[PDB]
Amino acid sequence: KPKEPVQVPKLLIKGGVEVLEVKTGVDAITEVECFLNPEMGDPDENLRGFSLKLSAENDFSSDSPERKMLPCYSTARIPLPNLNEDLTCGNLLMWEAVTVQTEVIGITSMLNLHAGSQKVHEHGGGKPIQGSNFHFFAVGGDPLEMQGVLMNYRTKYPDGTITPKNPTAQSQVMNTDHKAYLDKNNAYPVECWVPDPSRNENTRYFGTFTGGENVPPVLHVTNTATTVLLDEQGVGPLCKADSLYVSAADICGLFTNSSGTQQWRGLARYFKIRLRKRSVKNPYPISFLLSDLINRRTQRVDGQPMYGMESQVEEVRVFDGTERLPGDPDMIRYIDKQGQLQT
Amino acid sequence: GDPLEMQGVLMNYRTKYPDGTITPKNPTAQSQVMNTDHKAYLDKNNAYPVE
Amino acid sequence: QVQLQESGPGLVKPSQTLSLTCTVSGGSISGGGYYWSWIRQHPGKGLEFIGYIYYNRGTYYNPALKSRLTISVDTSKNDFSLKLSSVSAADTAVYYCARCVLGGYGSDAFDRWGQGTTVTVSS
Amino acid sequence: EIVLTQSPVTLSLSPGERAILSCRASQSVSSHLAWYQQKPGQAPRLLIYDASSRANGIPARFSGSGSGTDFTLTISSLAPEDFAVYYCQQRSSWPPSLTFGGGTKVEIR
Numbered sequence: 001k002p003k004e005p006v007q008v009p010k011l012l013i014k015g016g017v018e019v020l021e022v023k024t025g026v027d028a029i030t031e032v033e034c035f036l037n038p039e040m041g042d043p044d045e046n047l048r049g050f051s052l053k054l055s056a057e058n059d060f061s062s063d064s065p066e067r068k069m070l071p072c073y074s075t076a077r078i079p080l081p082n083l084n085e086d087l088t089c090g091n092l093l094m095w096e097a098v099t100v101q102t103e104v105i106g107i108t109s110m111l112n113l114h115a116g117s118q119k120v121h122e123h124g125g126g127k128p129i130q131g132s133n134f135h136f137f138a139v140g141g142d143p144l145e146m147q148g149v150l151m152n153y154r155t156k157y158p159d160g161t162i163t164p165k166n167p168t169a170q171s172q173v174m175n176t177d178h179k180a181y182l183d184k185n186n187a188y189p190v191e192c193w194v195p196d197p198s199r200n201e202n203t204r205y206f207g208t209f210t211g212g213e214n215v216p217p218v219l220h221v222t223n224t225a226t227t228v229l230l231d232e233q234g235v236g237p238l239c240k241a242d243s244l245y246v247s248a249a250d251i252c253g254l255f256t257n258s259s260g261t262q263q264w265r266g267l268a269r270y271f272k273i274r275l276r277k278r279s280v281k282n283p284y285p286i287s288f289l290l291s292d293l294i295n296r297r298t299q300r301v302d303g304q305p306m307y308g309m310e311s312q313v314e315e316v317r318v319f320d321g322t323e324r325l326p327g328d329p330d331m332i333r334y335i336d337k338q339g340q341l342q343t
Numbered sequence: 344g345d346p347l348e349m350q351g352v353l354m355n356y357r358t359k360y361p362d363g364t365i366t367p368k369n370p371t372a373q374s375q376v377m378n379t380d381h382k383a384y385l386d387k388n389n390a391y392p393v394e
Numbered sequence: 395q396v397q398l399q400e401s402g403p404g405l406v407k408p409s410q411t412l413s414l415t416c417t418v419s420g421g422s423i424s425g426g427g428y429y430w431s432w433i434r435q436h437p438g439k440g441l442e443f444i445g446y447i448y449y450n451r452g453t454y455y456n457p458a459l460k461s462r463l464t465i466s467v468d469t470s471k472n473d474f475s476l477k478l479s480s481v482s483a484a485d486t487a488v489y490y491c492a493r494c495v496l497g498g499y500g501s502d503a504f505d506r507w508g509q510g511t512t513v514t515v516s517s
Numbered sequence: 518e519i520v521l522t523q524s525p526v527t528l529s530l531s532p533g534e535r536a537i538l539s540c541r542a543s544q545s546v547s548s549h550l551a552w553y554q555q556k557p558g559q560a561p562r563l564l565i566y567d568a569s570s571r572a573n574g575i576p577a578r579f580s581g582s583g584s585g586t587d588f589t590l591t592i593s594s595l596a597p598e599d600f601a602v603y604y605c606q607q608r609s610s611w612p613p614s615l616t617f618g619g620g621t622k623v624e625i626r
Binding site: 433440441442443454456457490492499500501502503504505507509510 | 518549551553560561562563566567572574602604606608613615616617618619620
């Protein structure tokens with residue numbers, strides 16, 4: 001006698017990008033295998049995958065780069081079907097990213113030593129691509145909200161680039177007023193925008209940096225990796241709107257030409273985002289639509305401010321519950337706010 | 344249990360190889376990044392160059 | 395280094411079928427992120443888009459010309475084609491053919507298109 | 518569809534001045550813009566791709582600026598080999614349109 005086969009998730013439909021809008025049951029799974037294009041700048045002569053040569057001796061007083069010389073993050077979007085059909089007051093039914101899987105495409109393209117590299121010594125081969133790497137990707141239901149950081153505030157950027165505003169010495173430290181969104185492929189330069197670690201309740205990003213003058217780049221390729229994107233509460237990146245946002249950027253190191261010019265190099269990136277269906281509280285009830293009905297039509301009023309730094313609302317006493325009459329009308333809360341401490 | 348289905352990626356797609364090497368035919372600009380035009384099948388010893 | 399050319403008729407009678415060849419030499423017509431477009435420019439007006447082709451069954455036409463077109467590709471002579479149906483006297487215009495790139499520049503701009511040819515239709 | 522309304526009609530401009538064109542769109546596409554230079558009796562040729570990126574071979578006296586709807590073909594100084602016919606073009610992502618505009622021809626006084 002043998003043994004009755006074991007059970008396995010009965011695979012269903014398969015095909016191109018237009019598979020998605022076919023409706024499924026309630027406990028569906030989905031697997032999405034997709035990639036991205038790295039944006040290294042792409043100079044001329046169809047060398048799509050390098051950058052232009054780097055500047056050598058720009059002083060701090062005046063910097064003049066070009067659009068080509070700065071790599072940028074890569075982002076895209078995945079449309080999704082909606083799931084609710086009738087009203088169904090109460091609860092809704094959204095998507096969820098659960099398990100990512102990344103893998104770099106073209107990693108053995110660096111073994112070319114018959115290229116236009118520098119002759120490394122007199123009768124040997126050439127010099128391979130070495131130096132600083134920075135690999136980075138992100139999966140979420142929302143655009144990747146990011147923090148503005150740079151050095152040398154006197155840099156005047158080219159006007160195709162989305163760069164932070166009013167450069168001071170405060171921009172060389174963690175500043176609060178350089179917030180923005182990520183809504184455009186090939187526009188945000190990588191030397192000016194780290195991910196904001198504060199604001200991301202619906203975006204998980206992974207990144208390992210290694211600078212240095214000339215260090216080896218170490219790459220893996222394995223189809224047994226698995227990175228769980230669940231949090232410590234039991235959710236993944238939820239999809240508020242019908243989308244799923246993918247953002248990444250891959251730097252591989254510097255290439256040396258045969259005469260001495262340095263120029264960058266990158267590769268693409270794989271993704272396998274397993275999705276599924278969850279049950280949440282409705283964030284769009286009829287009461288939200290009603291307020292957005294009236295607030296479209298009602299007249300704009302532009303008066304003196306009532307929110308922000310130059311505000312004029314002073315003290316708001318939000319109190320409901322009752323209590324035994326206090327023996328002080330103005331009770332104080334902090335014990336010593338400013339400090340009258342020792343020594 | 345099946346031959347190793349691979350992916351064609353290369354740089355400097357204007358390089359001309361000898362006849363023994365099975366290279367990606369019709370080399371385009373897309374081959375230096377993720378391209379879809381270069382599926383293949385591993386079936387032949389000493390044939391597919393690893394770069 | 396890619397060289398292009400054009401060829402075809404020089405005079406088309408009313409209510410006939412027009413055919414043109416956008417000759418390509420020095421590159422694959424099966425080229426990955428490449429389209430292959432047509433641009434007409436009528437004497438006295440600007441230019442107008444007609445149609446591009448993707449060699450894994452991607453077509454798109456200008457909806458003003460109402461899907462009266464077929465664009466065919468023959469891989470041997472490295473060249474593609476174009477078909478008009480039921481031409482009129484208004485079609486007398488110099489005709490250009492060019493290429494679109496998806497990952498690089500993003501348009502018909504890389505100094506890469508046909509050198510031009512003229513079509514005359516009258517009585 | 519999408520229509521690129523272009524204005525002015527025919528600028529009467531002397532050599533050496535600052536020229537500005539404006540290809541204001543019916544709706545925002547904001548990144549898939551081009552600028553085609555064509556002389557009469559010649560073939561088309563690019564000025565600016567992606568609305569700000571200069572072309573290799575075009576010297577830096579031209580530039581591109583602006584995105585959203587109100588676009589700008591910035592010209593620092595006009596050349597006697599530049600008094601010709603200038604166009605604009607809108608691309609398309611989801612739906613295939615990418616038609617073209619109307620044109621503005623620079624008159625030489």
